[PDB]
Design a protein around this nucleic acid. Structure first.
Lengths: 88, 1000
RNA sequence: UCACUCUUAAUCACACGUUGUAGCUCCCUUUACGUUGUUACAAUAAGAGAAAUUUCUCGCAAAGCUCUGUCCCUUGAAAUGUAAGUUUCAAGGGACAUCUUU
């Protein structure tokens, strides 16, 4: 699979997160850690604009990295879980 | 077959006593079946009383903060390297950055110096966070930052670096903050302005590496902070019109008004007014709902805090977060008049997508460009609901008419008890109460597994359960107050009756107290009472003013000292009824004047002059524990567990006062030793509080007041049976010998009571001691740390590493402590000037057992062992310690604690040695030696002596050092074996492990 | 009298403290180590997992028994065998974790 800003909210869902339980502890922990971290970073990607200490141009710069960083993590999460054969 | 028994429990912050008492088919106990005690470590810090997870939380915060600092330093280094400022990641950049930053002003710096100051700005960036809200720590930091900001706005300090090199390092001698100081902390905005000023000045001064994009990226780094029944259709966003409307509907239909038991839902006419407040007001509070509706003072909402306005004025029902956020962003920069079907799309656009382009493409059609600007610049939506979009548009029009969730769901879509479930931790904030109830649940499950379903569960909650740390500490304070008061009262009694025969009974002290408080006169008659005649039997008695049969009140407020002359005429009425107060007779008025002129407290005065019986309420208040934990436990046990009892009070939580009364009149009041067994006592008595027993007690009180020779007991010889079954070492022998006339007490279930202690087998813990020493002296086994003068006492003085280098230092510091009587602060509170200023000088300490930390350049003391491996070598016992740092490193030690020698060469647990077993803290061991045998819980290992401490199962004062056998050596012992115990104290038997397990 | 000791802060962050290597500087021991004060940089639990010198998340708590492991117990089935008693598998109930959650 490939993740962009268009499908990130669609793939980072509770059903996919729940179906990571069958994984063994060896690989389950890093995959969930990457996936949960990606969700948290992306869910607050626009939070920068709501602070008086951040300029709009700076907030634009922060928002682009926040989405780019979070998309990268879930791509790693799917890639490693698909390596273990997940019915994503 | 399964028995018919009542289970009594006694709960306290660190213990759970339990009794199993057989009952007949009536509510009448027959004989004691079983009894036991389970202890556990109080679920809070042993001394400070903070949460046990608070240290872990602070450690997580520190680790994360350091990790973020390292990450942003890495990113700054890489960015400088890519922009060619940094030749490579590691160059020895200059160390005078502060003087370089000011030199960077009004001069140009080379590439190395410029990189150094840039990385220094990134590393030390300052505070961001109106003002003056909560804390003194904040207060100090903010005061320092504000003073520095005030100072910076002068011509002499163009930037914080100039302020540091001008104001800081001429009056204090140092740039950085020293000790607990915040006077040198700077604002993030001030340092950002400094960086912008440096870029602007260096640009004009010929610096090539001062790009606009470089400035922007460095601002980004120095300013960044991490922010804090349906079909296939996906769930809806939380910050949408439909979802917020849904939640408001649920809250509006979940409203109940309680007016002295008249708990009712809103009138349907009243609900229309509340329908749309949140659209008009951003955060309607409980003040708004009470003011708009037709309510009054004696009316409050469920979930009450508790009239007091702040409880209700500052409590929000539903916050239209999305609605008013969009309102403010659209008004500050179309109008707020919007159609729901567009608000939902806006919310979904900002919840599913966070980039400008995606949300612009998703909402290109139904949104104008200025609205796009207003929403894009200042909006952020986060979470989602657990209900699909299509479901909401149908469910909302139904619940707006006064429906419920499941009822509307059924209209749209029509289509474990035997044991106690786990404690609902969301209903219990207290970790201590949570652990107490968890252990109670474990005890109940064990008892049910051993005997079956109980007919009833009776509960005795300790006074200190369900309280904060400070509340229990003040309870301890006033407990000692009462202790000194009672011993002083005994002394005063001995003064007033010198010819007494020793220790007074409990009745006599209260007789003297009442004699004092009623001013040597009886209340009812008014006759004068003589102090010298006070102690003969029959002269006076302590009488319940309000009868006990009618009130069940054993409190001090119900006792009056009364001559036996007049109680022969009264019976069991109240003083109003007895003295004909309804007609306002001379008797009642004289008695009322007499009681009101006494030294009684007001509550006692009004309880004596009651005029009202209120039997049902008073008795129910006096007999049952009304606290939160008691009510919750009754509800939880009744609803979630199976009890074979007839009625609706299958669970009984008795008031502690009635339990004390029963324990006193049943003969076993002060039958409690200093061991942990005494808890069981209370369980037994609370297990015997069946309604038939209380009726028997009421009838006996009716006898002794106005109408069995002695106070009822559950059966004959109850006191001694309970005492033997709880405290005897071999209760069978004592029961058969000292109590021959009661063969029923000795049965198949009679076993010696063994107290079961909670296991502690966790392998995770604190890695080492926080104090970090330097590791280059371990080859001789000594600890070199910086020793502050203000902390250095006389002993630390001689253990210095400089008495061999500066005898003048040693001698002068010695006499300084002499002149202050061994007080370090008093001597060196004045700047100590060496023959330079001395604030802390390195010292030496004992260090021969340490963990290597700080990339191998530091050492620390071991914190706590998590396992002890017992081996047999050469026919003798050896003990290998296993700490947490060994577990984390995954190493399996082979060195056993040997005495007079250090771990450099201990006894090696080689192939010649045989692994016996492993021990975790608070594990049961049996040790037989040439002298005696001890069966006790393992309580640590001494690394130096190689000896162990084991805990007596009940902590008797008569055994060991206050209950623990300290310093027991096992090298030459006969047998040292590990055992196992159930939660009920049963099944003490040998356990033989097969293989030595790894640490990970 | 067979009665009694019952008149909230979180999450973001800041700044220290300590250890080590450098630049200054104070003292100072012997036939090069110490080492005061000050600045910089690295580290700031011991560490573990996964994927590429580098990236994530976890890393001192509580509770839980669904998975895994340790131990205790009950029940049944096989091979036995100097006829005593062993060895093995099956499944039921618990206690705890190096297991599972939050």
């Amino acid at each position: 699979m490939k993740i962009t800003s268009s499908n990130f909210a669609t793939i980072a869902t509770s059903e996919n997160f729940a179906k990571l339980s069958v994984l063994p502890k060896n690989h389950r922990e890093p995959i969930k850690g990457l996936f949960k971290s990606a969700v948290e970073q992306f869910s607050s990607a626009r939070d920068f604009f709501k602070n008086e200490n951040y300029s709009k141009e700076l907030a634009e710069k922060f928002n682009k990295e926040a989405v780019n960083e979070a998309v990268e993590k879930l791509q790693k999460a799917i890639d490693l879980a698909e390596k273990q054969g997940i019915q994503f | 077959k399964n028995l018919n028994y009542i289970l009594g429990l006694d709960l306290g912050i660190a213990s759970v006593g339990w009794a199993v008492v057989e009952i007949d088919e009536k509510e009448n106990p027959l004989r004691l079946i079983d009894v036991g005690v389970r202890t556990f470590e109080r679920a809070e810090v042993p001394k400070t009383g903070e949460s046990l997870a608070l240290s872990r939380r602070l450690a997580r915060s520190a680790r994360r903060l350091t990790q973020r600092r390292v990450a942003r330093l890495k990113k700054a280094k890489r960015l400088l390297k890519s922009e060619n400022i940094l030749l490579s990641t590691d160059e020895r950049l200059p160390h005078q950055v502060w003087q370089l930053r000011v030199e960077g002003l009004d001069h140009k710096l080379e590439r190395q110096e410029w990189a150094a100051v840039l990385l220094h700005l990134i590393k030390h960036r300052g505070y961001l966070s109106e003002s003056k809200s909560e804390n003194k720590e904040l207060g100090a930091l903010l005061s320092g930052v504000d003073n520095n900001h005030k100072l910076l706005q002068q011509a002499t300090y163009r930037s914080p670096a100039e302020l540091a090199v001008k104001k800081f390092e001429v009056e204090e001698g140092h740039i950085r903050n020293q000790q607990g100081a915040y006077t040198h902390t700077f604002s993030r905005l001030d340092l950002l302005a400094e960086m912008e000023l440096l870029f602007s000045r260096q640009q004009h001064f010929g610096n090539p590496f001062a790009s606009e994009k470089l400035l922007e990226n460095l601002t980004a780094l120095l300013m960044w902070q991490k922010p804090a029944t349906f079909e296939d259709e996906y769930k809806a966003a939380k910050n949408t019109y439909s979802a917020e409307r849904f939640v408001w509907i649920t809250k509006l239909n979940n409203l109940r008004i309680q007016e002295n038991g008249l708990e009712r839902a809103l009138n349907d006419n009243e609900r229309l007014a509340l329908m749309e407040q949140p659209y008009d007001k951003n955060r309607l509070f409980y003040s708004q709902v009470r003011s708009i509706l037709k309510l009054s003072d004696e009316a409050i909402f469920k979930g009450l805090r508790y009239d007091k306005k702040a409880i209700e004025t500052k409590a929000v029902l539903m916050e239209m977060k999305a609605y008013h956020q969009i309102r403010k962003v659209l008004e500050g920069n179309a109008e707020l008049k919007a159609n729901p079907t567009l608000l939902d799309e806006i919310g979904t656009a900002f919840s599913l997508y966070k980039t400008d382009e995606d949300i612009s493409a998703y909402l290109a059609g139904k949104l104008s460009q200025p609205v796009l600007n207003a929403l894009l610049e200042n909006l952020s939506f986060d979470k989602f609901i657990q209900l699909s979009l299509k479901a909401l548009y149908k469910l909302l029009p139904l619940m707006q008419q006064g429906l419920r969730y499941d009822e509307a769901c059924r209209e749209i879509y029509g289509d474990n008890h035997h044991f106690l479930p786990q404690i609902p931790a969301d209903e219990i904030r207290n970790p201590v109460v949570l652990r107490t109830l968890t252990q109670a649940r474990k005890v109940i499950n064990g008892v049910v597994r051993l005997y079956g379903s109980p007919a009833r569960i009776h509960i005795e909650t300790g006074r200190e359960v369900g309280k904060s740390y400070k509340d229990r500490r003040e309870l301890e304070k006033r407990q000692e107050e009462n202790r000194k008061q009672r011993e002083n009262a005994i002394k005063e009694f001995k003064e007033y009756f010198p010819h007494f025969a020793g220790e007074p009974k409990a009745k006599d002290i209260l007789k003297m107290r009442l004699y004092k408080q009623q001013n040597a006169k009886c209340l009812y008659s008014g006759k004068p009472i003589e102090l010298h005649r006070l102690l003969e039997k029959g002269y006076v008695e302590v009488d319940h003013a309000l009868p006990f049969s009618r009130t069940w009140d054993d409190s001090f407020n119900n006792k009056v000292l009364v001559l036996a002359n007049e109680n022969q005429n009264k019976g069991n009425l109240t003083p109003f009824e007895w003295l004909d107060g309804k007609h306002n007779s001379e008797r009642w008025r004289a008695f009322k004047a007499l009681v009101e002129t006494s030294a009684f407290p007001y509550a006692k005065k009004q309880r004596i002059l009651s005029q009202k019986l209120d039997e049902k309420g008073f008795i129910e208040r006096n007999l049952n524990d009304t606290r939160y934990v008691a009510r919750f436990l009754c509800n939880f046990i009744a609803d979630n567990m199976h009890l074979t009892g007839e009625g609706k009070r299958k669970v009984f939580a008795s008031n502690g006062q009635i339990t004390a009364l029963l324990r006193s009149r049943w003969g076993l009041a002060k039958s409690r030793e200093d061991n942990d067994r005494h808890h069981a006592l209370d369980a037994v008595v609370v297990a015997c509080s069946t309604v038939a027993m209380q009726q028997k007690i009421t009838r006996f009180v009716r006898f002794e007041a106005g109408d069995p020779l002695h106070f009822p007991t559950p059966w004959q010889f109850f006191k001694q049976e309970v005492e033997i079954r709880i405290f005897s070492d071999n209760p069978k022998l004592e029961l058969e010998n000292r109590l021959p006339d009661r063969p029923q007490a000795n049965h198949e279930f009679v076993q010696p009571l063994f107290v079961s202690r909670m296991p502690t087998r966790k392998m995770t813990g604190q890695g080492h001691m926080e104090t970090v020493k330097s590791a280059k002296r371990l080859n001789e086994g000594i600890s070199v740390i910086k020793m502050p003068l203000t902390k250095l006492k006389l002993k630390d003085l001689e253990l210095m590493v400089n008495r061999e280098r500066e005898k003048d230092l040693y001698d002068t510091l010695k006499a300084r402590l002499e002149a202050f009587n061994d007080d370090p602060a008093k001597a060196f509170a004045e700047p100590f000037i060496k023959k330079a200023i001395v604030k802390s000088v390195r010292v030496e300490q004992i260090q021969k057992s340490g963990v290597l930390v700080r990339e191998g350049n530091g050492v620390a003391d071991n914190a706590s062992m998590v396992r002890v491996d017992v081996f047999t070598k050469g026919g003798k016992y050896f003990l290998v310690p296993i700490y947490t740092w060994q577990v984390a490193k995954g190493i399996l030690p082979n060195k056993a604690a040997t005495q007079y020698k250090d771990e450099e060469d201990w006894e090696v647990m080689d192939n010649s040695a045989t692994f016996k077993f492993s021990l975790h803290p608070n594990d049961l061991v049996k040790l037989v030696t040439k002298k005696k045998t001890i069966l006790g819980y393992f309580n640590g290992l001494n690394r130096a002596t190689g000896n162990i401490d084991i805990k007596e199962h009940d902590l008797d004062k008569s055994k060991g050092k206050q209950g623990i056998f300290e310093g027991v050596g096992i090298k030459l012992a006969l047998s040292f074996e590990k055992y196992q115990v159930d939660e009920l104290g049963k099944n003490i038997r040998l356990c033989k492990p097969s293989k030595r397990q790894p640490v990970r």
